[PDB]
Design a protein around this motif. Structure first.
Motif, short mmCIF file in Angstrom:
data_model
loop_
_atom_site.label_atom_id
_atom_site.label_comp_id
_atom_site.label_asym_id
_atom_site.label_seq_id
_atom_site.Cartn_x
_atom_site.Cartn_y
_atom_site.Cartn_z
N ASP A 1 5.53 23.65 41.12
CA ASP A 1 4.46 23.10 39.98
C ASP A 1 4.26 24.48 38.80
O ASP A 1 5.56 24.94 38.34
CB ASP A 1 2.80 23.42 40.32
N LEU A 2 2.78 24.40 37.68
CA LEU A 2 3.42 25.77 36.87
C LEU A 2 3.50 26.65 37.54
O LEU A 2 3.70 27.23 37.05
CB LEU A 2 2.55 25.51 35.62
N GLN B 1 13.20 29.97 39.29
CA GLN B 1 13.10 29.77 38.72
C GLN B 1 13.56 28.63 37.22
O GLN B 1 13.32 27.58 36.74
CB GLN B 1 12.33 30.58 37.97
N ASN B 2 14.73 29.73 37.04
CA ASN B 2 16.14 29.13 36.15
C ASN B 2 16.82 28.50 36.81
O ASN B 2 16.84 27.09 35.30
CB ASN B 2 16.93 30.87 35.83
#
Length: 139
Positions: free
Chosen positions: A138-139, A128-129
């Motif tokens: 996506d979100l 995610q980083n």
């Protein structure tokens, strides 16, 4: 060409090594044991079957009814068992490049499973980083 319903065996023979082997390809013990009929069919479906990037090899050492070289394709792994999963043709990428995507993870016998889950969560946070993804996340 790589390896088919033997490409994965060969790779695991070298990778698994118990800190000093890098054996390369085929496992004589799996061929020598010749177990089991159900296992041969599950392995054959994994090899050239589509559709399914998973297999476990379970070591499971000592204890009671140890899985040992388990393992199965999907199914289940019980307990000090030590085995692994690899990704081949992760629905179907088979019959073209040898499942280049194949992902490999080793799984010890031993909690240990909770620690592995925490490590997986840390890897997801690191991902995610790094990127944002291709919207599959996506979100």
């Amino acid at each position: 060409m790589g390896d088919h319903s033997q490409k994965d065996s060969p790779e695991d023979f070298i990778i698994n090594r118990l800190s000093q082997a890098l054996g390369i390809q085929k496992e004589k013990i799996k061929k020598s044991l010749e177990t089991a009929q159900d296992d041969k069919g599950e392995v054959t479906n994994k090899d050239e079957f589509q559709g399914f990037i998973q297999q476990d090899n379970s070591t499971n050492i000592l204890w009671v009814s140890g899985q040992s070289e388990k393992c199965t394709f999907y199914y289940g792994q019980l307990p000090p068992i030590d085995k692994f999963k690899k990704k081949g043709i992760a629905i179907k990428l088979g019959l073209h490049k040898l499942t280049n995507e194949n992902v490999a993870k080793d799984v010890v016998v031993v909690l240990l499973e909770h620690l592995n889950s925490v490590f997986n969560e840390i890897m997801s946070p690191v991902m995610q980083n790094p990127l944002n993804q291709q919207g599959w996340t996506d979100l």
